[PDB]
């Protein structure tokens, strides 16, 4: 069973303690943090960590292909550990944070409309943008 720092070294990345920290945070997160939120969380644990380190680390993870970058039109470049299974995204517009979902209801529905117009579905991009409901 592969962890992310374990999965980094596999692709010849120079890890340090600071990067393992940053790797553990990202791994542990299900909200797909941007660079800035990883920083705040990381610095909370290792105060020596710079924004410089976190940006480079992320960009280097991205070159290793061990994370997925997402540019949603919320207001943030969101990052996650490559998902073992596909899912879609819902974005809180108030806080910019991200919620993953797999509705196979929707998957099937998308699968069927491809057909209705004469198509086998090969890919899709599905993004939802919500505001929090009042109570």
CB 80 within 8 A of CB 68: yes
Per-residue contact flags (x/-) with Zn ion for residues 70 to 89, judged by CB under 5 A: ----------x-------x-
Per-residue contact flags (x/-) with a second copy for residues 86 to 115, judged by CB under 8 A: ----x-xx-----x-x-x-xx--xx--xxx
Residue nearer to a second copy on the CB measure, 46 or 127: 127
**CA dihedral in degrees (58, 62, 66, 71; nearest 10)?**
90
DSSP for residue 29: -
Which residues inside 23-52 make contact with a second copy, applying CB under 8 A? none
CB 87 within 8 A of CB 76: no
111 binds Zn ion (CB under 5 A): no
CB 95 within 8 A of CB 110: no
3-state secondary structure of 89: strand
Taking Cα atoms as reference points, which of 63, 107, 115 lies closest to residue 85? 107
71 binds a second copy (CB under 8 A): no
The residues that touch a second copy, with contacts defined as CB under 8 A, are 73, 90, 92-93, 99, 101, 103, 105-106, 109-110, 113-115, 117-133
The residues that touch Zn ion, with contacts defined as CB under 5 A, are 80, 88, 100
Binding residue numbers? 32, 80, 86, 88-89, 100, 107, 124
């Amino acid at each position: 069973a592969k962890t992310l720092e374990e999965l980094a070294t596999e692709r010849g990345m120079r890890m340090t303690e600071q990067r393992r920290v940053i790797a553990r945070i990202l791994e542990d997160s299900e909200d797909h943090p941007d660079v800035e939120e990883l920083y705040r969380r990381s610095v909370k644990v290792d105060a020596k960590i710079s924004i410089s380190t976190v940006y480079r680390t992320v960009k280097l993870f991205e070159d290793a292909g061990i994370i997925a970058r997402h540019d949603f039109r919320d207001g943030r470049s969101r990052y996650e550990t490559v998902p073992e299974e596909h899912h879609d995204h819902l974005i809180d517009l108030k806080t910019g944070t991200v919620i993953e979902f797999r509705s196979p209801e929707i998957e099937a529905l998308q699968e069927r409309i491809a057909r209705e117009h004469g198509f086998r579905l090969v890919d899709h991009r599905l993004e939802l943008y919500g505001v929090p409901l009042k109570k």
